[PDB]
Amino acid sequence: IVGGYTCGANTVPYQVSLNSGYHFCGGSLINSQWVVSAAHCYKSGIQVRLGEDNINVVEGNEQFISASKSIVHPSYNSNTLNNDIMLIKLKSAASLNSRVASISLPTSCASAGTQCLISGWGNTKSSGTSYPDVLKCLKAPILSDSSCKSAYPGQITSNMFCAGYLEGGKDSCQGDSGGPVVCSGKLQGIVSWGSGCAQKNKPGVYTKVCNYVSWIKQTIASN
Ligand SMILES: Cc1cc(Br)c([O-])c(-c2cc3cc(C(N)=[NH2+])ccc3[nH]2)c1
Ligand SMILES: [Ca+2]
Ligand SMILES: [Cl-]
């Protein structure tokens, strides 16, 4: 997260860190046994770390659970990142409480101007890599479709939306992928891609979760 602030320990209880010996992507807890992340974060050997704040120190509240299976969307396209969403089933259920909680799926899509909270342990520099130890937060609005398409002509599908600042300075970045974009208490987006991080006129692009709710429900119900 570039231009963001320290969230404060456990203030984002649905945030998870996907770990393979180091933090590589974020994710969101949607129920005690399932996490939603991005398809491009897929790899085998994923350990899901819940209740984290400093990812390099065990401070208490952490629950480390291995992924039992990861389900990448069948129509995921790695070249366009269209359908960039993945579900991870946990080997055992997590204990939910005030420090570890799930986030609700949306019932409707959000409109441009909606202010959302994006969080993650991704890079904090737009020119260089500085990865943080604690969770960072950024409040960002969803942009209109014309501004998004004018910024990325021909690369935005109906399963994506842009959120951020065209002046540059505040944005999500590598390491934040797979993480949550929460608006009015509902998970509306998944950090997916962008051109560089926090560059002017190049906002972040997110997977539009309202388009996958029946897919998530049907897939969870059959697995
Ligand atoms: C080299 C590399 C590898 C992975 Br995996 C990423 O997710 C990314 C990445 C860049 C990137 C940029 C943004 C943004 N909002 N500007 C968001 C997610 C991103 N993810 C980059
Ligand atoms: Ca920790
Ligand atoms: Cl276009």
For 35, the enclosing helix (H) or strand (E) is: strand 34-37
Minimum-distance ligand 1 atom for the alpha carbon of 205: 15
Please state the φ and ψ torsions of residue 209, each to the nearest 5 degrees. Answer: -60, -35
Instruction: Evaluate: CB of 204 within 6 angstroms of ligand 1.
Output: yes
Three-class secondary structure of residue 14 per DSSP? coil
Query: Please, is 154 exposed, middle or buried when counting C-beta atoms within 10 Å of its C-beta (0-12, 13-18, 19+)?
Result: exposed
CA-wise closest residue to 25 among 15, 34, 33: 15
CA of 95 from ligand 1 middle (Å) equals: 31
φ and ψ at 147, to 5 degrees?
Answer: -70, -40
At 4, give phi and psi (nearest 5°).
-100, -165
Give backbone dihedrals phi and psi of 6, rounded to 5 degrees, phi first. -70, 125
Among 180, 186, 177, 176, residue whose Cα is nearest residue 210: 186
Domains and CATH numbers, the chain: 1-12+103-210 (2.40.10.10), 13-102+211-222 (2.40.10.10)
Q: Are 111 and 142 in contact (CB under 8 A)?
A: yes
End-to-end Cα separation, the chain, in angstroms: 33
Counting every residue written for the chain, the total comes to 223
Active site residues: 40, 84, 177
Pairing of strands 5-6, 63-72: unpaired
- For ligand 1, whether the C-beta of 194 sits within 6 Å is yes
Residue nearest to atom 3 of ligand 1 (CA): 174
Residue whose CA lies nearest to ligand 1 atom number 4: 174
Entry resolution (Å): 1.5
Considering only CA atoms, which residue is closest to atom 2 of ligand 1?
174
Q: Is 203 in the pocket of ligand 1 (CB under 6 A)?
A: no
Q: Which residues surround ligand 2, an ion (CB under 5 A)?
A: 52, 54, 57
